[PDB]
Coordinates of C-alpha atoms in Angstrom, one line a residue:
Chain A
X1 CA 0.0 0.0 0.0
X2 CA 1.5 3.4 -1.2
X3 CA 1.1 6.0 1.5
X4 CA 0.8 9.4 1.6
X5 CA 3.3 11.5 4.2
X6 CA 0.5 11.7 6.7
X7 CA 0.1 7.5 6.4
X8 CA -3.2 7.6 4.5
X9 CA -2.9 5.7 1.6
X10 CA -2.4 7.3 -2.2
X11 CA -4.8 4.4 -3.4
X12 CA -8.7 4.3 -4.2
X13 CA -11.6 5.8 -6.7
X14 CA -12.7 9.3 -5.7
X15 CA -17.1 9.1 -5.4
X16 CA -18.6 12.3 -6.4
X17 CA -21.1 13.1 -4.0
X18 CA -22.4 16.2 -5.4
X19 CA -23.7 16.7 -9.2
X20 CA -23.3 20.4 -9.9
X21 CA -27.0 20.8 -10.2
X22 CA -29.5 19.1 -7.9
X23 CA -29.3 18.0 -4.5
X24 CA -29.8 14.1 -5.3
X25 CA -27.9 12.3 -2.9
X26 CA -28.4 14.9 0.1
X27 CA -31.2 15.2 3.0
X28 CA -32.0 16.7 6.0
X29 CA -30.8 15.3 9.6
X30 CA -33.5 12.9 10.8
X31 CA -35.5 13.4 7.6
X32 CA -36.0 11.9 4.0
X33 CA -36.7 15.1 2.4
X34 CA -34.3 18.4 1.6
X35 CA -35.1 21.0 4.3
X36 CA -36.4 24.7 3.1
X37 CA -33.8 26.6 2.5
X38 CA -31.6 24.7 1.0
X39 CA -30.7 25.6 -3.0
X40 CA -28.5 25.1 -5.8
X41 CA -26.7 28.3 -6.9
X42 CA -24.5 28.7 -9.8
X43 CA -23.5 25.2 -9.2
X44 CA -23.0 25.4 -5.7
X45 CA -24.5 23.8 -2.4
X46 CA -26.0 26.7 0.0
X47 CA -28.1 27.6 2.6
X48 CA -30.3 30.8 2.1
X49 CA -33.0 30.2 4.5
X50 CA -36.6 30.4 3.9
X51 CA -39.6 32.8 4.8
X52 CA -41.4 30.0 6.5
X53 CA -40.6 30.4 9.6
X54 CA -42.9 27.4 10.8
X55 CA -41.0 24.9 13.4
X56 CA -40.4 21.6 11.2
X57 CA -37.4 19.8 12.4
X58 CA -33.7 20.5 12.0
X59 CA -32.5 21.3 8.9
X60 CA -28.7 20.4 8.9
X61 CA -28.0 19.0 5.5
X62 CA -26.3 15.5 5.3
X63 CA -24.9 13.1 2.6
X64 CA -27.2 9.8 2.6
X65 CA -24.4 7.3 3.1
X66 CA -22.5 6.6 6.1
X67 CA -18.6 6.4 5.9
X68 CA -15.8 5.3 8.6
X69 CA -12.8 5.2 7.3
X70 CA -12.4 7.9 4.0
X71 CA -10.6 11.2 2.2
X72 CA -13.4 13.7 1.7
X73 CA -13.0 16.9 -0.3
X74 CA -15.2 20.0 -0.4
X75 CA -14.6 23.1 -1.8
X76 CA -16.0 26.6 0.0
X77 CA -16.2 30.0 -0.4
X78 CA -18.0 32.4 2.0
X79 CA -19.4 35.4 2.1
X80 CA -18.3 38.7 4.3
X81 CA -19.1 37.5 8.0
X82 CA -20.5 34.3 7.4
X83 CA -20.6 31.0 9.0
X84 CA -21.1 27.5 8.1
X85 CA -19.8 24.1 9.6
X86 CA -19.2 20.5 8.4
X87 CA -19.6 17.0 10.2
X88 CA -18.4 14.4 9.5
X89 CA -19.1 11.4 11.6
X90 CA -22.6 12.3 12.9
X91 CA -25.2 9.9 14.3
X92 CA -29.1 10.8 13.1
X93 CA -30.6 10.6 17.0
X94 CA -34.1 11.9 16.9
X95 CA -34.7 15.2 18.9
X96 CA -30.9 15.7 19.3
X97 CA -28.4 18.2 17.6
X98 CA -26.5 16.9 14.8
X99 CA -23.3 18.6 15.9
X100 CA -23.8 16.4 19.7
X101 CA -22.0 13.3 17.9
X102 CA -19.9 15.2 15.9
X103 CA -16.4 17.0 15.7
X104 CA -17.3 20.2 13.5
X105 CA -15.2 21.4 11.0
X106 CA -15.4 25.1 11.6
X107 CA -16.1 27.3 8.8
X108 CA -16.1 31.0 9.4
X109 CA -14.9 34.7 8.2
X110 CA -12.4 34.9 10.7
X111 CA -12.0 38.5 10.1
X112 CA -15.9 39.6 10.7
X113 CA -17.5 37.2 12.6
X114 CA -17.3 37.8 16.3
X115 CA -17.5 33.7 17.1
X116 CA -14.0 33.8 15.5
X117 CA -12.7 35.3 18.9
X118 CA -15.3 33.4 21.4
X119 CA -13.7 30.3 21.6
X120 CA -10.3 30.0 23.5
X121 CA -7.3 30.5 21.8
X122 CA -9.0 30.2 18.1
X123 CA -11.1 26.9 18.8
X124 CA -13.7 28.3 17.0
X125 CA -11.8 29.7 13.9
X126 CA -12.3 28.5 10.6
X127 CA -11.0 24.8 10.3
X128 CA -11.1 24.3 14.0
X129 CA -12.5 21.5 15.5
X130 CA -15.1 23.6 17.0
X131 CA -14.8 24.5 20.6
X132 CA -12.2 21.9 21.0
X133 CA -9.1 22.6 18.8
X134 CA -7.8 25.5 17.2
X135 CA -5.9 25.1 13.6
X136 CA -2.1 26.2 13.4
X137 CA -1.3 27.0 10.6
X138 CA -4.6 29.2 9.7
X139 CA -4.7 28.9 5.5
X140 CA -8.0 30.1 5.1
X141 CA -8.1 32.8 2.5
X142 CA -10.1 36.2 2.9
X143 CA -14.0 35.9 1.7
X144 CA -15.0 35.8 -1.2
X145 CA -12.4 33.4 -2.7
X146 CA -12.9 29.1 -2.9
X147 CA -11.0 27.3 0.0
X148 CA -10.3 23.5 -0.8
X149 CA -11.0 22.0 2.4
X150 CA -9.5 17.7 3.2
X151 CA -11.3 15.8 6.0
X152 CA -8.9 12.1 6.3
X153 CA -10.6 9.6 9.1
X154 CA -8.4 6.8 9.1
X155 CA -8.2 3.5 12.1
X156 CA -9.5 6.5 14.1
X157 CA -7.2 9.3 13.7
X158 CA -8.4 12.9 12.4
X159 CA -6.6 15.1 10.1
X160 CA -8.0 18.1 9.0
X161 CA -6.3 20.1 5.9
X162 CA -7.2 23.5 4.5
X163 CA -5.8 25.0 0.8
X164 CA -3.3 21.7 0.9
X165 CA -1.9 22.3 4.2
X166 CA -2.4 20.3 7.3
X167 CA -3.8 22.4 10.3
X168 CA -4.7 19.7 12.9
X169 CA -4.4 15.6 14.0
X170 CA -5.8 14.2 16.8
X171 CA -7.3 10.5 17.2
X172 CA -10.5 9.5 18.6
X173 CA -10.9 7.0 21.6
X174 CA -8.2 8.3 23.4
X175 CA -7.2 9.9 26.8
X176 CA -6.8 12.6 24.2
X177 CA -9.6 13.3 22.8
X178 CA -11.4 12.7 26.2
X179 CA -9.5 15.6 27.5
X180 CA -10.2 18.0 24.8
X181 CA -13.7 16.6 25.0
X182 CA -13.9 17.4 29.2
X183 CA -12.6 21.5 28.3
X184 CA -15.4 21.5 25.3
X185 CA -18.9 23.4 25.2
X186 CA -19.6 19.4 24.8
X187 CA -18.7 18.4 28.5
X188 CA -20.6 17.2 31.4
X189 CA -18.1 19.8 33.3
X190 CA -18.8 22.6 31.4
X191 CA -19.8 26.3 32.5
X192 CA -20.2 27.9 28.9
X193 CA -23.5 29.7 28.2
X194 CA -23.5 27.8 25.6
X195 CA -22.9 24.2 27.1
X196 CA -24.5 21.2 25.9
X197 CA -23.7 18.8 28.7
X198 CA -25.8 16.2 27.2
X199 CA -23.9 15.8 24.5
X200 CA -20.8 14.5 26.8
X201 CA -21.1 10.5 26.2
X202 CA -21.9 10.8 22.3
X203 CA -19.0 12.9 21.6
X204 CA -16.7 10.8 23.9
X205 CA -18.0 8.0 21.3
X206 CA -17.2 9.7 17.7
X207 CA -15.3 7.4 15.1
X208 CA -16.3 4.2 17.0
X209 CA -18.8 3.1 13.8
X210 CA -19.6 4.9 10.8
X211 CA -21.6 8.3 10.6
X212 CA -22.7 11.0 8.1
X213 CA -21.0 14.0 6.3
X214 CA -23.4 17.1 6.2
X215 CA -23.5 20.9 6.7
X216 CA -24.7 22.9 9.2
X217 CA -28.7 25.0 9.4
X218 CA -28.4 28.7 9.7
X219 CA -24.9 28.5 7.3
X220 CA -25.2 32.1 5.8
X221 CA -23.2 33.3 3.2
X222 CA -21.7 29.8 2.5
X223 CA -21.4 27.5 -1.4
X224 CA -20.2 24.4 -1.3
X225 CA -18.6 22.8 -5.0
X226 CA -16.3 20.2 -5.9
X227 CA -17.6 17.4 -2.8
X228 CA -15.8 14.1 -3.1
X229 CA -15.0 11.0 -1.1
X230 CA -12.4 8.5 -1.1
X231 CA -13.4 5.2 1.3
X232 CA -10.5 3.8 2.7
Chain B
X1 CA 15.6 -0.3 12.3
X2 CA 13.2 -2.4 14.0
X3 CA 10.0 -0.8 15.6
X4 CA 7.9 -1.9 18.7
X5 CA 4.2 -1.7 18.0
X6 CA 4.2 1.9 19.0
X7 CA 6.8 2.7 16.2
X8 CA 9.7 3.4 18.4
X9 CA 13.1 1.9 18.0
X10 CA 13.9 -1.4 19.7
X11 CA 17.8 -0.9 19.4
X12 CA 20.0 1.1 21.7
X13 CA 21.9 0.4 25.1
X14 CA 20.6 1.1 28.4
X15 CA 22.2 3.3 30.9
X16 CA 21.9 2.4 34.5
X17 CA 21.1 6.0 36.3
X18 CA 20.9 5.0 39.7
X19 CA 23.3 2.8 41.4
X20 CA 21.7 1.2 44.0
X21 CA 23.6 3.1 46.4
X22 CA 24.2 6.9 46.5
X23 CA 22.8 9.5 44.3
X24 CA 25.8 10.3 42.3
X25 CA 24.7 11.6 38.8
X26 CA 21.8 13.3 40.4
X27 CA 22.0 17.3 41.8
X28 CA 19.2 19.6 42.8
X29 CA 17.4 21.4 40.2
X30 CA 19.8 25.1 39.0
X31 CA 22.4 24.0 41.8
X32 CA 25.5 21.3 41.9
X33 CA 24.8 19.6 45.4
X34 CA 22.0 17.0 46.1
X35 CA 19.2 19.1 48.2
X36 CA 18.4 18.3 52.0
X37 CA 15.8 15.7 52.2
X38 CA 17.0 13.2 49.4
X39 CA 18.1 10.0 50.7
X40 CA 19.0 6.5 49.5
X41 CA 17.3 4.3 51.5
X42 CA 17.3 0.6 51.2
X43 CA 18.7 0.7 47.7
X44 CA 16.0 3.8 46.4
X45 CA 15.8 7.2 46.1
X46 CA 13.5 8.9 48.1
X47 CA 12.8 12.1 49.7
X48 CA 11.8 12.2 53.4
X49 CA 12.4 16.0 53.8
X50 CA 14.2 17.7 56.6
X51 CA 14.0 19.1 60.2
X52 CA 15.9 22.2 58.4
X53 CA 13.0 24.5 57.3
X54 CA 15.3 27.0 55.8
X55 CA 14.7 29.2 52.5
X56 CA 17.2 27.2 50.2
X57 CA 16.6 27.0 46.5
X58 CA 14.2 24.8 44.9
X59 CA 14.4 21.0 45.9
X60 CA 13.5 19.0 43.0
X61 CA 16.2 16.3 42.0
X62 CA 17.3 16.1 38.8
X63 CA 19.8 13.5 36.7
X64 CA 22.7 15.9 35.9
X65 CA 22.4 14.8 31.6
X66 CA 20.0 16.1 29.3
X67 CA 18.2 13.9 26.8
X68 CA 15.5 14.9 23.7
X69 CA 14.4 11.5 22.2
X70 CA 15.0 8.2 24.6
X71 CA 13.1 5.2 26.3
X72 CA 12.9 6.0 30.3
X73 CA 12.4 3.3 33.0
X74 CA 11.6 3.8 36.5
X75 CA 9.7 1.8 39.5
X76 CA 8.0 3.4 42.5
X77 CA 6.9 2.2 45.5
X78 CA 4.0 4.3 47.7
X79 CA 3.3 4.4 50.8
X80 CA 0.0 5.1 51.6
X81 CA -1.6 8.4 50.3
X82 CA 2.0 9.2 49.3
X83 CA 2.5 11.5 46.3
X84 CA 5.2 12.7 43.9
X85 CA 5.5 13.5 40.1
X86 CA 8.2 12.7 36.8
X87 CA 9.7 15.7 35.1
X88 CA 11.1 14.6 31.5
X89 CA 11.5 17.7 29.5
X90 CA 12.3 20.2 32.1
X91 CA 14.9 23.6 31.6
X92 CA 16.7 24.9 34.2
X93 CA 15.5 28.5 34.6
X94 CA 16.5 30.4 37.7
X95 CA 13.6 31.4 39.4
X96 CA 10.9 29.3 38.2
X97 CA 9.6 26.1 39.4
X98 CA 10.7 22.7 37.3
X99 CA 7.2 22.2 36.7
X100 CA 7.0 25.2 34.3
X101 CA 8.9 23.6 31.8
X102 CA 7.9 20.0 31.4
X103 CA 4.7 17.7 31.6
X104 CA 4.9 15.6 34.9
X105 CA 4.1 12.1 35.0
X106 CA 2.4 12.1 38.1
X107 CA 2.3 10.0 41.2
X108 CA -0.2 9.5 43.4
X109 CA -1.8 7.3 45.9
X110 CA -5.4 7.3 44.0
X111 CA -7.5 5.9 47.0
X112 CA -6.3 7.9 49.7
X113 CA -4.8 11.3 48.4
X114 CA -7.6 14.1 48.0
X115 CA -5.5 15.5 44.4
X116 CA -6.7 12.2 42.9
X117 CA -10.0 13.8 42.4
X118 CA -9.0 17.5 42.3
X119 CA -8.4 17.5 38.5
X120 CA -11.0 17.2 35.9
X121 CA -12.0 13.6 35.1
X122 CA -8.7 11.7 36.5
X123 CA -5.9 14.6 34.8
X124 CA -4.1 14.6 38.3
X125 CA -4.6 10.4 38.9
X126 CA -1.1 8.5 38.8
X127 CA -0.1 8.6 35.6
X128 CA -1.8 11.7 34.3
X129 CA 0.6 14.5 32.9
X130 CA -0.8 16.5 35.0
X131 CA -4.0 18.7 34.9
X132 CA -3.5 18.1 31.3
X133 CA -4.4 14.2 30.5
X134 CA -5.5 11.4 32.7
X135 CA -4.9 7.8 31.7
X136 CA -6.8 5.4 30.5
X137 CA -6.4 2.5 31.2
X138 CA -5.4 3.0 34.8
X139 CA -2.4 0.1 35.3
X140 CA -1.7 1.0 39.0
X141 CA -0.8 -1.3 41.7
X142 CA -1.9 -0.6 45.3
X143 CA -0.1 1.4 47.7
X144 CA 2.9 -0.6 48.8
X145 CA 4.0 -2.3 45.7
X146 CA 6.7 -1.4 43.2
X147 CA 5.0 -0.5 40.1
X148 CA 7.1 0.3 36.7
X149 CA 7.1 3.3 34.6
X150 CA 8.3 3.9 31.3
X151 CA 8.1 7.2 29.5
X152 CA 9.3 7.5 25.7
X153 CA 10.0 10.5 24.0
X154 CA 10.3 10.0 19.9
X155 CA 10.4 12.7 17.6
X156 CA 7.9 14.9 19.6
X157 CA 5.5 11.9 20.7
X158 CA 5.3 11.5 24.1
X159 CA 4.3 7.9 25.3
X160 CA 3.2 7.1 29.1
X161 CA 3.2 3.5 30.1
X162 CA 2.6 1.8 33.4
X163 CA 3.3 -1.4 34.3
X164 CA 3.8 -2.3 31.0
X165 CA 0.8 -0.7 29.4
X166 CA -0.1 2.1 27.3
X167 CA -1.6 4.8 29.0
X168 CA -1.7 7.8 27.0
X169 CA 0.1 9.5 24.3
X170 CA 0.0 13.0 22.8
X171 CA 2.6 15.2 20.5
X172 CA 4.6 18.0 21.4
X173 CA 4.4 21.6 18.9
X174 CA 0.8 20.2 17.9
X175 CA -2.5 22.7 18.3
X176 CA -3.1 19.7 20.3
X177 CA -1.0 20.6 22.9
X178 CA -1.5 24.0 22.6
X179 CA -6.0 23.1 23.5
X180 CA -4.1 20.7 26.3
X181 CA -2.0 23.4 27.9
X182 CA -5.1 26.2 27.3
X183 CA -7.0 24.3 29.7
X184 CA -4.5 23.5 32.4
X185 CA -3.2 25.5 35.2
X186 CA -0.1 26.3 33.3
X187 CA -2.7 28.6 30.9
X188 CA -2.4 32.3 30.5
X189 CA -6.2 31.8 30.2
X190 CA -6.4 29.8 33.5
X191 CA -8.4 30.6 36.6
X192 CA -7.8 27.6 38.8
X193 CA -6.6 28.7 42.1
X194 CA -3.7 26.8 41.4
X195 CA -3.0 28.8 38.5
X196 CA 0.5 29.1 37.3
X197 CA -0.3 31.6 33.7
X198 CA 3.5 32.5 33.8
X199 CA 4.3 28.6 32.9
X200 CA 2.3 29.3 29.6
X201 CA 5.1 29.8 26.6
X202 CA 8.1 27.2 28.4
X203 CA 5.2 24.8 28.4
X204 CA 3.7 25.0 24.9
X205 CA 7.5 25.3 24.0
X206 CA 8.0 21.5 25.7
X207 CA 10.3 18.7 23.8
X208 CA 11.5 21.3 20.8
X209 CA 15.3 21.2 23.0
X210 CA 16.7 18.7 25.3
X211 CA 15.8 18.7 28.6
X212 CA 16.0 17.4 32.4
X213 CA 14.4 14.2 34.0
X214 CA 13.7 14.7 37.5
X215 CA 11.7 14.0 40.6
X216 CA 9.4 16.3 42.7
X217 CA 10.2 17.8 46.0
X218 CA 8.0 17.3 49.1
X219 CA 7.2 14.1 47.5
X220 CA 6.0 12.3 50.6
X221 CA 6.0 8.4 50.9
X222 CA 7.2 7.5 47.0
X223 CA 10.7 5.3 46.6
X224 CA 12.6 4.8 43.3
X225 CA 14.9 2.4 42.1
X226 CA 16.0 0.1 38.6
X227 CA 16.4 3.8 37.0
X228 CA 17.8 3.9 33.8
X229 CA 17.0 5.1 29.9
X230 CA 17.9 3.9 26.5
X231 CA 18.7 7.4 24.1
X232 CA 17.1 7.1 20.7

């Protein structure tokens, strides 16, 4: 097996998960259907939100297919102060958050958003694993321009790479990730105002079966091209 | 080269550290003699402390060679709620404590020493680097009987292992670290009450030179012996 410098190996046949056109292949979290506000634009995945305002469920977008082991690509660009978010090894639980049993890929205007300086120590800045691990080196180009994000998930260790450059590795069902886990919005011990204690065992539990790629509800400002996966 | 299943060399000599008998090789931490209270006692090294309550320097003891990547081996014995800590990586910087510039393998008695459960979900638990990760599994003998340590250093990974098991492992100069140390007491962000924010930038600066293996001061009830390390 040829591998890459990371360890991942060179071999396999990229899926194209996304046709440039439709959403066929894509559905909401917990549902069959596309949620409202959800569109093709100019060839891109995005989220503009509707006028109905009417409380149907969530409306996180997610690829209908679970993966464990895999390469995914995606390519983004985003607006001036906008916000969007990718999972990648979510569980559908009825009547509980997509992002509970999943890291987040953190996708953000780092120079106009004010999340971009809420989290500690640029946890919450674009390509962070969100509230949990900031990104060093920060590639992300200014908005307005495509980013070429890389999501690798291999015998349980993370990398995520932004613009062809590595910005974090960490590996699930360790002490590790336990510990970044306990400091997290996502911890039983946690004192944020945004704290989702209940979330605590599920995210302690990511990367132990397969799960779902999607995008996050509420993503203004955010296309999505170029979306492919290589199983590993 | 041949690899153990943790990908660290298998080659090299070992270097006996302790003799059995005196502490020769070992000196206080930033001074040449050995500092009141360290003793050898029944063929270990242990520190009992000293009717001399004078303001000397620091206290820690340290083996008088600094190392970067090696295999370290080291048994304890404590008595019972007994407590003391491994320093692996440590600088000598006049002034400020050992434990500035190094994680610390810690040592505790878990059942009867009230630290045990001071940290957050097991960090400051024998074997933890502590206030940072705890470790899972949990390998430790009772209070009374020689357990065995070995900590490797490879390259910037940082293995813990007790009693020959795996306990944790992490990587120096990673954004992982960096979320590790954010959240400790050795943060410029902490508010523990045992905060030590002026530890912040010698800690996320850990493993990128050689450094100092050492043993805490006032580290009551714990005896060492069969000391010695392999340099990679």
């Amino acid at each position: 097996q040829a591998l890459d410098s990371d360890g991942i190996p060179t071999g396999g046949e990229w899926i194209t998960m996304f046709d440039g056109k439709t959403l066929n292949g894509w559905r909401g979290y917990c549902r069959q259907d596309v949620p409202l506000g959800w569109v093709v634009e100019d060839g891109s995945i995005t989220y503009k939100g509707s006028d109905n305002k009417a409380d149907t469920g969530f409306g996180d977008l997610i690829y209908d297919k679970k993966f464990k082991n895999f390469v995914f690509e995606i390519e983004w660009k985003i607006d001036k102060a906008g916000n969007s978010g990718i999972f990648y090894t979510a569980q559908e639980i009825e009547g509980t958050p997509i992002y509970y049993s999943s890291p987040e890929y953190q996708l953000l205007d780092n120079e106009n958003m004010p999340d971009a300086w809420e989290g500690c120590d640029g946890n919450r800045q674009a390509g962070a694993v969100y509230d949990m691990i900031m990104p060093d080196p920060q590639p992300v180009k200014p908005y307005g321009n495509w980013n070429k994000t890389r999501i690798v998930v291999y015998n349980q260790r993370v990398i995520h790479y932004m613009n062809d450059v590595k910005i974090l590795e960490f590996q699930f069902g360790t002490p590790v990730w336990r510990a970044l886990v306990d400091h997290s919005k996502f911890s039983k011990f946690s004192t944020s105002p945004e704290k989702c204690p209940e979330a605590y065992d599920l995210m302690l539990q990511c990367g132990k079966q397969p799960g779902y790629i999607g995008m996050q509800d509420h993503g203004y400002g955010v296309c999505f091209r170029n979306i492919r996966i290589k199983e590993l």
